[PDB]
Coordinates of C-alpha atoms and ligand atoms in Angstrom, one line a residue:
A1 CA 101.3 113.9 247.4
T2 CA 98.3 116.3 247.0
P3 CA 97.4 118.7 244.3
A4 CA 98.7 121.6 246.5
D5 CA 102.1 119.8 246.9
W6 CA 102.3 119.2 243.1
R7 CA 101.8 122.8 242.0
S8 CA 105.5 123.6 242.8
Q9 CA 107.0 120.6 240.9
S10 CA 108.6 120.4 237.5
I11 CA 108.5 117.1 235.5
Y12 CA 111.0 115.3 233.3
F13 CA 108.9 112.7 231.3
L14 CA 110.8 109.7 229.9
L15 CA 110.1 106.3 228.3
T16 CA 111.6 103.7 230.5
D17 CA 112.7 101.6 227.5
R18 CA 114.5 104.5 225.9
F19 CA 116.1 106.5 228.7
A20 CA 119.0 104.6 230.3
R21 CA 120.2 100.9 230.2
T22 CA 121.6 99.1 233.3
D23 CA 125.0 98.8 231.5
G24 CA 125.2 102.6 231.1
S25 CA 125.9 102.3 227.3
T26 CA 125.7 105.4 225.2
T27 CA 126.1 103.6 221.9
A28 CA 123.8 100.5 221.9
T29 CA 121.7 100.4 218.8
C30 CA 118.1 101.7 219.0
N31 CA 116.6 102.1 215.5
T32 CA 113.2 103.7 216.1
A33 CA 111.9 102.2 212.9
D34 CA 112.3 98.6 214.3
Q35 CA 109.8 99.3 217.2
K36 CA 111.6 96.8 219.4
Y37 CA 112.6 96.9 223.1
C38 CA 115.9 98.8 223.1
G39 CA 116.7 97.8 226.7
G40 CA 116.0 100.8 229.1
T41 CA 115.5 99.9 232.7
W42 CA 114.4 101.3 236.1
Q43 CA 118.0 100.8 237.4
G44 CA 119.3 102.9 234.5
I45 CA 117.0 105.8 235.5
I46 CA 118.5 105.6 239.1
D47 CA 122.1 105.9 237.7
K48 CA 121.3 109.0 235.8
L49 CA 119.4 110.9 238.5
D50 CA 122.2 113.5 238.7
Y51 CA 121.7 114.2 235.0
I52 CA 118.0 114.8 235.6
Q53 CA 118.2 116.9 238.8
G54 CA 121.0 119.0 237.4
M55 CA 118.5 120.5 235.0
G56 CA 116.5 121.5 238.2
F57 CA 113.6 119.0 237.7
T58 CA 111.8 118.0 240.9
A59 CA 110.0 115.0 239.5
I60 CA 109.8 112.3 236.8
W61 CA 106.9 110.8 234.8
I62 CA 107.7 107.2 233.6
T63 CA 105.5 105.1 231.1
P64 CA 103.3 102.2 232.3
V65 CA 104.7 99.4 234.5
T66 CA 102.2 96.5 234.1
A67 CA 103.0 93.2 232.3
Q68 CA 102.3 93.4 228.5
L69 CA 101.4 91.1 225.6
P70 CA 104.7 89.1 225.0
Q71 CA 104.6 89.1 221.2
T72 CA 106.6 91.0 218.6
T73 CA 103.5 92.3 216.7
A74 CA 103.4 93.8 213.2
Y75 CA 103.7 97.2 215.1
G76 CA 106.7 95.9 217.1
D77 CA 107.1 95.1 220.8
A78 CA 105.1 96.7 223.6
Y79 CA 108.2 98.7 224.7
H80 CA 106.0 101.8 225.4
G81 CA 103.9 100.0 228.1
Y82 CA 100.4 100.7 226.7
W83 CA 99.4 97.2 225.7
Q84 CA 98.8 95.4 229.1
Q85 CA 97.6 91.9 229.7
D86 CA 98.3 91.2 233.4
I87 CA 97.7 94.2 235.8
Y88 CA 99.0 92.2 238.8
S89 CA 102.5 91.7 237.4
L90 CA 105.3 94.0 236.2
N91 CA 106.9 94.3 232.8
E92 CA 110.1 92.2 233.4
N93 CA 112.0 94.0 230.6
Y94 CA 112.5 97.0 233.0
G95 CA 113.5 95.1 236.1
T96 CA 111.9 93.6 239.2
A97 CA 109.4 94.9 241.9
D98 CA 112.5 95.7 244.0
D99 CA 114.0 97.8 241.2
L100 CA 110.7 99.8 241.0
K101 CA 110.8 100.3 244.8
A102 CA 114.5 101.2 244.7
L103 CA 113.6 103.9 242.2
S104 CA 110.9 105.5 244.3
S105 CA 113.2 105.6 247.3
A106 CA 116.2 107.0 245.3
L107 CA 113.9 109.8 244.1
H108 CA 112.5 110.5 247.6
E109 CA 116.0 110.6 249.1
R110 CA 116.8 113.5 246.8
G111 CA 113.6 115.3 247.7
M112 CA 112.1 114.4 244.3
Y113 CA 108.6 112.9 243.4
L114 CA 107.7 109.8 241.3
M115 CA 104.7 110.0 238.9
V116 CA 103.5 106.8 237.1
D117 CA 101.5 106.5 233.9
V118 CA 98.4 104.2 234.2
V119 CA 95.8 102.8 231.7
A120 CA 92.3 101.8 232.8
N121 CA 90.6 102.1 229.4
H122 CA 91.9 98.9 227.8
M123 CA 94.2 95.8 227.5
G124 CA 96.4 94.9 224.4
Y125 CA 96.2 91.9 222.1
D126 CA 98.3 90.6 219.1
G127 CA 95.6 90.2 216.4
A128 CA 92.1 91.1 215.1
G129 CA 89.2 92.2 217.3
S130 CA 87.0 89.3 216.4
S131 CA 89.7 86.8 217.2
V132 CA 90.5 87.8 220.8
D133 CA 91.1 85.1 223.4
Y134 CA 89.9 86.7 226.7
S135 CA 91.4 84.0 228.8
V136 CA 94.9 85.7 228.5
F137 CA 93.9 88.8 230.5
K138 CA 94.3 89.0 234.3
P139 CA 92.2 89.5 236.0
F140 CA 89.5 90.3 233.4
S141 CA 89.4 86.8 231.9
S142 CA 86.1 86.9 230.1
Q143 CA 84.5 88.8 227.3
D144 CA 81.8 89.9 229.7
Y145 CA 84.1 92.5 231.3
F146 CA 84.4 94.2 227.9
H147 CA 82.5 96.3 225.5
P148 CA 81.2 94.5 222.3
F149 CA 83.8 94.8 219.5
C150 CA 83.6 98.0 217.4
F151 CA 86.3 100.4 216.1
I152 CA 86.0 104.2 216.6
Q153 CA 84.9 105.6 213.3
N154 CA 83.8 109.1 214.3
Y155 CA 85.8 110.9 217.0
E156 CA 83.0 113.5 217.2
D157 CA 80.6 110.9 218.5
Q158 CA 81.4 110.7 222.2
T159 CA 79.5 107.4 222.5
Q160 CA 81.7 105.6 220.0
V161 CA 84.7 107.3 221.6
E162 CA 83.9 105.8 225.0
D163 CA 82.3 102.4 224.1
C164 CA 84.2 101.3 220.9
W165 CA 87.8 100.0 220.8
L166 CA 91.0 102.0 220.2
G167 CA 93.6 100.4 217.8
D168 CA 92.9 98.2 214.8
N169 CA 92.9 94.8 213.1
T170 CA 96.7 94.5 213.6
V171 CA 97.0 95.4 217.2
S172 CA 93.6 95.5 218.9
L173 CA 92.9 97.1 222.3
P174 CA 90.0 95.3 224.0
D175 CA 87.9 98.0 225.7
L176 CA 86.8 97.5 229.3
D177 CA 83.1 98.1 230.1
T178 CA 83.9 100.7 232.8
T179 CA 80.2 101.2 233.5
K180 CA 80.0 97.7 235.2
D181 CA 80.6 97.6 239.0
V182 CA 83.0 94.7 238.9
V183 CA 85.2 96.7 236.6
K184 CA 85.0 99.8 238.7
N185 CA 85.6 97.9 241.9
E186 CA 88.7 96.1 240.6
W187 CA 90.3 99.2 239.2
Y188 CA 89.6 101.2 242.4
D189 CA 91.2 98.5 244.5
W190 CA 94.2 98.1 242.2
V191 CA 95.0 101.8 241.9
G192 CA 95.1 102.3 245.7
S193 CA 97.4 99.3 246.1
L194 CA 99.7 100.2 243.3
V195 CA 100.2 103.6 244.9
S196 CA 100.8 102.2 248.4
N197 CA 103.1 99.4 247.2
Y198 CA 105.6 101.5 245.3
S199 CA 105.1 104.8 247.2
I200 CA 104.0 106.7 244.1
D201 CA 103.5 110.5 244.6
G202 CA 101.2 111.3 241.6
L203 CA 99.7 109.6 238.5
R204 CA 99.5 110.4 234.8
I205 CA 96.2 108.8 233.5
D206 CA 96.1 107.6 229.9
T207 CA 93.1 107.8 227.6
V208 CA 90.8 109.8 229.9
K209 CA 88.3 110.9 227.1
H210 CA 87.7 107.3 226.3
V211 CA 86.1 106.4 229.7
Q212 CA 82.8 107.9 230.8
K213 CA 83.2 110.9 233.1
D214 CA 81.5 109.4 236.1
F215 CA 84.2 106.7 236.4
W216 CA 87.0 109.2 237.3
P217 CA 86.0 110.8 240.6
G218 CA 86.2 107.5 242.4
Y219 CA 89.5 106.5 240.7
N220 CA 91.1 109.8 241.7
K221 CA 89.9 109.3 245.3
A222 CA 91.0 105.6 245.4
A223 CA 94.4 106.6 244.2
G224 CA 94.7 109.2 247.0
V225 CA 97.3 111.3 245.2
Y226 CA 97.3 114.0 242.5
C227 CA 96.0 112.7 239.1
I228 CA 96.8 114.5 235.9
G229 CA 94.7 113.2 232.9
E230 CA 95.4 112.9 229.2
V231 CA 92.5 114.3 227.3
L232 CA 93.8 114.7 223.7
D233 CA 91.8 117.6 222.5
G234 CA 92.7 121.2 221.7
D235 CA 89.3 122.7 222.6
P236 CA 89.3 124.2 226.1
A237 CA 85.4 123.8 226.1
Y238 CA 85.9 120.0 225.8
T239 CA 89.0 119.4 227.9
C240 CA 88.8 121.7 230.8
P241 CA 85.5 120.3 232.1
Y242 CA 87.5 117.1 232.8
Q243 CA 88.9 119.2 235.7
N244 CA 85.5 118.7 237.3
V245 CA 86.2 115.0 237.6
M246 CA 90.0 114.8 238.2
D247 CA 92.7 117.1 239.8
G248 CA 94.3 118.2 236.5
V249 CA 94.7 117.5 232.8
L250 CA 97.5 117.9 230.4
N251 CA 97.4 121.3 228.7
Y252 CA 96.5 120.4 225.1
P253 CA 94.5 123.6 224.7
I254 CA 97.8 125.7 225.1
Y255 CA 99.9 123.2 223.1
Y256 CA 98.5 124.1 219.7
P257 CA 98.9 127.9 219.9
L258 CA 102.2 127.6 221.7
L259 CA 103.8 125.4 219.0
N260 CA 102.4 127.6 216.2
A261 CA 103.8 130.8 217.9
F262 CA 107.3 129.5 218.1
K263 CA 107.7 127.0 215.2
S264 CA 108.4 129.8 212.8
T265 CA 109.4 133.5 212.7
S266 CA 105.9 134.1 211.4
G267 CA 104.1 132.4 214.3
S268 CA 101.1 134.2 215.9
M269 CA 101.6 135.8 219.3
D270 CA 97.9 136.7 219.3
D271 CA 96.5 133.2 219.3
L272 CA 98.9 132.4 222.2
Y273 CA 97.9 135.5 224.2
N274 CA 94.2 134.8 223.8
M275 CA 94.5 131.1 224.8
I276 CA 96.4 132.0 228.0
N277 CA 93.6 134.2 229.0
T278 CA 90.9 131.7 228.0
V279 CA 92.4 128.9 230.0
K280 CA 92.8 131.3 232.9
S281 CA 89.2 132.3 233.0
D282 CA 87.6 129.0 231.8
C283 CA 89.4 126.1 233.3
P284 CA 88.6 125.3 236.9
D285 CA 92.3 125.8 237.9
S286 CA 95.0 126.6 235.4
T287 CA 97.7 126.1 238.1
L288 CA 96.9 122.4 238.2
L289 CA 97.4 121.8 234.4
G290 CA 100.6 120.4 232.9
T291 CA 102.3 122.5 230.2
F292 CA 104.3 120.9 227.4
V293 CA 105.4 121.3 223.8
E294 CA 106.8 117.8 223.1
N295 CA 105.7 114.3 223.8
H296 CA 105.6 110.7 222.3
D297 CA 102.4 111.3 220.3
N298 CA 103.5 114.4 218.2
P299 CA 106.5 115.4 216.1
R300 CA 109.4 116.9 218.3
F301 CA 109.8 120.6 218.2
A302 CA 113.1 120.4 216.2
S303 CA 111.3 118.4 213.4
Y304 CA 109.5 121.7 212.7
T305 CA 112.5 124.1 212.9
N306 CA 116.1 123.5 213.8
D307 CA 116.4 127.1 215.1
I308 CA 118.0 127.0 218.5
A309 CA 116.7 130.4 219.7
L310 CA 113.1 129.4 218.9
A311 CA 113.7 126.1 220.9
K312 CA 115.1 128.2 223.9
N313 CA 112.0 130.4 224.0
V314 CA 109.5 127.6 223.9
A315 CA 111.3 125.8 226.7
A316 CA 111.3 129.0 228.8
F317 CA 107.5 129.3 228.3
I318 CA 106.9 125.8 229.5
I319 CA 108.8 126.3 232.8
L320 CA 107.4 129.7 233.6
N321 CA 103.7 129.3 232.6
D322 CA 101.0 128.5 235.1
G323 CA 100.9 124.8 236.1
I324 CA 103.5 122.1 236.2
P325 CA 106.3 122.2 233.6
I326 CA 106.8 118.9 231.6
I327 CA 109.8 118.4 229.4
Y328 CA 110.1 115.2 227.2
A329 CA 113.5 113.4 227.4
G330 CA 115.5 114.3 224.3
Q331 CA 114.0 117.8 224.1
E332 CA 117.0 119.1 226.0
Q333 CA 119.3 117.5 223.5
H334 CA 117.5 119.1 220.5
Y335 CA 116.1 115.7 219.1
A336 CA 114.2 116.0 215.9
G337 CA 112.2 112.8 215.2
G338 CA 108.8 113.0 213.5
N339 CA 105.6 111.0 214.3
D340 CA 105.5 107.7 216.1
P341 CA 107.7 105.8 216.1
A342 CA 110.4 108.4 215.2
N343 CA 109.8 110.5 218.3
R344 CA 110.7 107.7 220.7
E345 CA 114.5 108.1 220.3
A346 CA 116.9 106.7 222.9
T347 CA 118.2 109.4 225.1
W348 CA 121.5 107.6 225.7
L349 CA 122.6 108.1 222.1
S350 CA 123.1 111.7 222.9
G351 CA 125.9 110.9 225.4
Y352 CA 124.0 112.9 228.0
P353 CA 126.1 116.1 227.7
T354 CA 125.4 118.6 230.5
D355 CA 126.8 121.5 228.5
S356 CA 124.3 121.3 225.6
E357 CA 122.5 124.6 224.8
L358 CA 119.0 123.5 226.0
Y359 CA 120.4 121.6 229.0
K360 CA 121.8 125.0 230.2
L361 CA 118.7 127.1 229.4
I362 CA 116.4 124.6 231.1
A363 CA 118.7 124.5 234.2
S364 CA 118.7 128.3 234.4
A365 CA 114.9 128.6 234.0
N366 CA 114.2 125.9 236.5
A367 CA 116.7 127.6 238.9
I368 CA 114.8 130.9 239.0
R369 CA 111.4 129.1 239.2
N370 CA 112.6 127.0 242.1
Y371 CA 114.2 130.0 243.9
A372 CA 111.1 132.2 243.4
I373 CA 108.7 129.7 245.0
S374 CA 111.1 129.4 247.9
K375 CA 110.5 133.1 248.5
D376 CA 107.0 133.8 247.4
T377 CA 104.3 131.4 248.7
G378 CA 101.9 133.1 246.2
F379 CA 104.0 132.4 243.1
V380 CA 102.2 129.1 242.3
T381 CA 98.6 130.4 242.8
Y382 CA 99.2 133.8 241.2
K383 CA 97.6 133.4 237.6
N384 CA 100.1 134.1 234.8
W385 CA 99.2 137.3 233.0
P386 CA 100.3 138.4 229.5
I387 CA 101.2 142.1 229.8
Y388 CA 102.3 142.9 226.3
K389 CA 102.5 141.5 222.8
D390 CA 103.7 142.6 219.4
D391 CA 104.1 140.7 216.1
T392 CA 107.2 138.9 217.3
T393 CA 107.1 139.2 221.1
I394 CA 105.0 138.2 224.1
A395 CA 105.8 139.1 227.7
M396 CA 104.2 137.8 230.9
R397 CA 104.1 138.4 234.6
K398 CA 103.7 136.0 237.5
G399 CA 104.4 136.3 241.2
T400 CA 103.2 138.4 244.2
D401 CA 103.5 142.2 243.5
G402 CA 107.1 143.2 244.4
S403 CA 108.5 139.7 243.7
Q404 CA 107.2 139.1 240.2
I405 CA 109.1 137.3 237.5
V406 CA 108.7 139.1 234.1
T407 CA 109.5 136.9 231.0
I408 CA 110.0 138.3 227.6
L409 CA 109.7 135.8 224.7
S410 CA 110.5 136.2 221.0
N411 CA 110.0 134.4 217.7
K412 CA 112.5 136.4 215.7
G413 CA 114.9 133.4 215.7
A414 CA 118.7 133.1 215.9
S415 CA 119.1 135.8 213.2
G416 CA 117.1 138.3 215.1
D417 CA 118.4 141.9 215.0
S418 CA 119.6 143.7 218.2
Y419 CA 117.4 146.5 219.6
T420 CA 116.0 147.8 222.9
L421 CA 112.4 147.0 223.8
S422 CA 110.9 149.6 226.2
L423 CA 108.5 147.4 228.2
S424 CA 105.6 148.9 230.2
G425 CA 103.4 147.0 232.6
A426 CA 106.1 145.1 234.5
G427 CA 105.1 146.5 237.9
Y428 CA 108.6 147.3 239.2
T429 CA 109.4 150.6 240.8
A430 CA 111.5 153.4 239.5
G431 CA 115.2 153.0 239.8
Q432 CA 114.9 149.4 240.8
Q433 CA 117.8 147.1 239.6
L434 CA 116.8 143.9 237.9
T435 CA 118.8 140.8 236.9
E436 CA 118.2 139.1 233.6
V437 CA 118.7 135.6 234.9
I438 CA 119.3 133.6 231.7
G439 CA 122.3 135.6 230.5
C440 CA 123.1 137.1 233.9
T441 CA 123.2 140.8 233.2
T442 CA 121.5 143.8 234.9
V443 CA 119.0 146.3 233.8
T444 CA 117.6 149.4 235.6
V445 CA 113.9 150.4 235.6
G446 CA 113.5 153.9 234.1
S447 CA 111.9 156.8 236.0
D448 CA 108.5 156.3 234.4
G449 CA 108.4 152.6 235.5
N450 CA 109.4 151.3 232.0
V451 CA 112.1 148.6 231.5
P452 CA 114.7 149.0 228.7
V453 CA 115.3 145.4 227.7
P454 CA 118.2 144.6 225.4
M455 CA 117.0 142.2 222.6
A456 CA 119.3 140.2 220.3
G457 CA 119.7 136.7 218.8
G458 CA 116.0 136.1 219.3
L459 CA 116.9 135.2 222.9
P460 CA 114.3 134.9 225.8
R461 CA 114.8 137.3 228.7
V462 CA 113.7 136.5 232.3
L463 CA 113.7 139.4 234.9
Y464 CA 113.7 139.4 238.7
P465 CA 114.6 141.9 241.4
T466 CA 118.3 142.0 242.1
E467 CA 117.8 142.7 245.8
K468 CA 115.8 139.5 246.1
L469 CA 118.5 137.3 244.7
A470 CA 120.4 138.0 247.9
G471 CA 122.0 134.9 249.3
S472 CA 121.1 132.9 246.2
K473 CA 123.6 131.3 243.9
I474 CA 122.0 132.6 240.7
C475 CA 124.2 134.9 238.6
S476 CA 126.6 134.8 241.6
Ligands
ABC1 C1 98.6 103.0 214.4 C2 99.8 103.2 215.4 O1 99.5 102.1 216.3 C3 100.4 101.9 217.4 O2 100.3 103.1 218.2 C4 100.4 102.9 219.6 C5 101.4 103.9 220.3 O3 102.7 103.6 219.7 C6 101.5 103.6 221.8 O4 102.3 104.7 222.4 C7 100.1 103.5 222.4 O5 99.6 104.9 222.3 C8 99.2 105.5 223.6 C9 97.7 105.5 223.8 C10 97.1 104.1 223.9 O6 97.3 103.6 225.2 C11 97.0 106.6 224.2 C12 97.5 108.0 224.6 N1 97.3 108.8 223.4 C13 96.2 108.7 222.4 C14 94.9 109.4 222.8 O7 94.5 108.9 224.1 C15 93.8 109.0 221.9 O8 92.7 109.9 222.2 C16 94.1 109.2 220.4 O9 94.1 110.6 220.2 C17 93.5 111.1 219.0 C18 92.3 112.0 219.4 O10 91.5 111.3 220.3 C19 91.6 112.5 218.2 O11 90.7 113.5 218.7 C20 92.7 113.2 217.3 O12 93.2 114.3 218.0 C21 93.0 115.6 217.6 C22 92.4 116.6 218.6 O13 91.0 116.1 218.8 C23 92.3 118.0 217.9 O14 91.7 118.9 218.9 C24 93.7 118.4 217.4 O15 93.7 119.6 216.7 O16 94.1 117.4 216.5 C25 94.4 116.1 217.1 C26 95.0 115.3 215.9 O17 93.7 112.3 217.0 C27 94.5 111.8 218.1 C28 95.5 110.8 217.4 O18 96.4 111.6 216.7 O19 95.4 108.7 220.1 C29 96.5 109.1 221.0 C30 97.8 108.5 220.4 C31 99.0 107.8 224.7 O20 99.7 109.0 225.0 C32 99.7 107.1 223.5 O21 101.1 107.1 223.6 O22 99.2 102.7 221.6 C33 99.0 103.1 220.3 C34 97.9 102.2 219.7 O23 98.3 100.8 219.7 C35 101.8 101.7 216.9 O24 102.8 101.5 217.8 C36 102.2 102.8 215.9 O25 103.5 102.6 215.4 C37 101.2 102.9 214.8 O26 101.5 104.0 213.9
CA2 CA1 86.5 102.9 226.6

């Protein structure tokens, strides 16, 4: 599917090994500290598609599918999919080629998209860099396809970052020489084939800053579908420019300020407001970035604060910001694991309750987003604009004038006092009735165009014109 098609989607990101088993168990042991395969499979994802769609997601991102190193290393099994050895075969721990195909067609039947994570930067090996046996890799069976062994000592030296090896002496990640034409040619041919064989709709590309920029334009074109890249860097002057060589990138620039604003009642709304504006002006297209606050490489939000009102607000931001929303499986169940491996918890242990607090908030936020784009073909290309901020509040506006959504977010927390915010700048007309779509109550615009928003419990408030909800099932 193209970049234009993808602007309207919302993604549920999951680790195949940790989401759902074929036997549907909700109590099978999965101690994250063991770093072993816990048993998730592609068939299990199919069985729980109602759980996922019920939150209003239109797509899923799944970790890498290729066959991995077989060993249990000192860092555990390659359950996460990032240590490949044979790119022409699939990881059998998750099922067969037919299962993968079954998945794509079960998604498509429901009007949903499939996004697959891919690695071009490196392969994986159980042992020290000097001792690698290149004959185990397929098809790159020789040391001549790879860069000479070196580890990345200085992450500020771009040359080292691209030409030296990620990993270490325990689990080493042999780095492909992506400047060689044989390497380019093989990867360009594989990526088009993988996409056509499994009917994939879009790709998440790992380790993009570790491969020279000029490789990417031809990979994105060979893939023929939207590519969103992982560039792990918080500086918009470093990451955004990658949008000149690939459709989109993950929004790490917004991640830092967003987490800092909501992880405590003293978080800064100023840093978040300024970064929204910077990304808006300085990235080639903000509407093609992926917004997130949790993933498998950082502590979960609840490891920072167990306050449920702060978790509601950060989740509302993610769905309603510019770009594509991305929630990480377990976020909706309020999971609190710390750094890898503790943030790779098995979703099934939660029992998949559809009446959890964040499951409901997410469902309501995705519901208004999905309905609005149904009615306003400009919603996805209108650039989100922060219209107000104070020490504990930020409010934003997105959507064509007359149909705009106005979202009011707070970091006061679950103890927050009850008061009335008089919000200016919303753009609605005098006397207009508005529905607050999270708690389903109504508010009326004052005669001077200001909106009297009832604040309490640190809850987020999402406003939309009552007349426009006509015929919808929202707040019915
Ligand atoms: C040492 C670890 O080794 C393995 O760790 C695994 C991991 O479990 C697996 O998931 C995969 O890991 C994946 C890989 C490798 O295929 C890459 C992508 N993620 C990578 C980035 O592609 C890379 O750039 C670097 O990312 C660096 C970044 O390049 C550097 O700039 C700084 O990032 C800065 C950023 O520059 C700055 O702006 C901001 O303020 O601070 C952050 C810390 O640190 C980051 C690491 O924390 O590491 C990330 C984990 C993926 O999302 C990630 O899941 O492989 C690694 C390496 O074997 C073990 O399993 C772990 O238990 C063990 O603790
Ligand atoms: Ca490299």
